[PDB]
A paper describes a structure:
Tripartite motif (TRIM)7 is an E3 ubiquitin ligase that was first identified through its interaction with glycogenin-1 (GN1), the autoglucosyltransferase that initiates glycogen biosynthesis. Human [name] is a 511-amino acid protein that displays the canonical TRIM/RBCC motif followed by a [name].2 C-terminal domain. TRIM7B30.2 structure reveals the typical [name].2 domain fold consisting of two antiparallel β-sheets of seven (β1, β2, β4, β9, β10, β11, and β13) and six (β3, β5, β6, β7, β8, and β12) strands, arranged as a distorted β-sandwich. The [name]/GNIP1–glycogenin interaction was shown to be mediated by the [name].2 domain, whereas the CC domain was involved in the protein self-association.
Numbering used by the authors: 339 to 511
């Protein structure tokens, strides 16, 4: 329910990321940029949020994914830690799919869950704050990939992480 028009929040972006000027695309750069030290900025983890956070309702958006390893995306609670090295786990307030070692995974803790979904090109993220779910679909055939069940009780932001050079995420279109 309700396609949303998202832009990456440049006050959150870790200084090693390269954002697109239209605030849709993100990759990892070779060096930290000299960005201003905003309190909301991830100073260590390779993360950026969208500027829009959701308190209720059902929302969906699409993410164009690179073929090469080194990305994760989904949603984060607003209280996700910004300063210091924070584990990438549901307990630390991130719910995401990742591509690592040529395999797709739901980032569950304490063990990640391997998916057998085959090659991904674009992924729909559906957030339902009434039901308490974030779900991922392959856009081709809208095949269900994975749903995290969470009793979300703070604002939820779209989350992107790129931890290797040579891959990318882009909010589509």
């Amino acid at each position: 329910e309700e396609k949303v028009e998202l832009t990456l929040d440049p006050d959150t972006a870790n200084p090693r990321l390269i954002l697109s000027l239209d605030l849709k695309g993100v990759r990892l750069g070779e060096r930290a940029q000299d960005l201003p030290n905003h309190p909301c900025r991830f100073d260590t983890n390779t993360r950026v949020l969208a500027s829009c956070g959701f308190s209720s309702g059902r929302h969906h958006w699409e993410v164009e994914v690179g073929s090469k390893d080194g990305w994760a995306f989904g949603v984060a609670r607003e209280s996700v830690r910004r300063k210091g090295l924070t584990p990438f786990t549901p307990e630390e307030g991130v719910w995401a799919l990742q591509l690592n070692g040529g395999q797709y995974w739901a980032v569950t803790s304490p063990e990640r869950s391997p998916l057998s979904c085959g090659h991904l090109s674009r992924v729909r993220v559906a957030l339902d704050l009434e039901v308490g779910a974030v779900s991922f679909y392959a856009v081709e055939d809208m095949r269900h990939l994975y749903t995290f069940r969470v009793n979300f009780q703070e604002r939820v932001f779209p989350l992107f992480s790129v931890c290797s050079t040579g891959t990318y995420l882009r909010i589509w279109p």
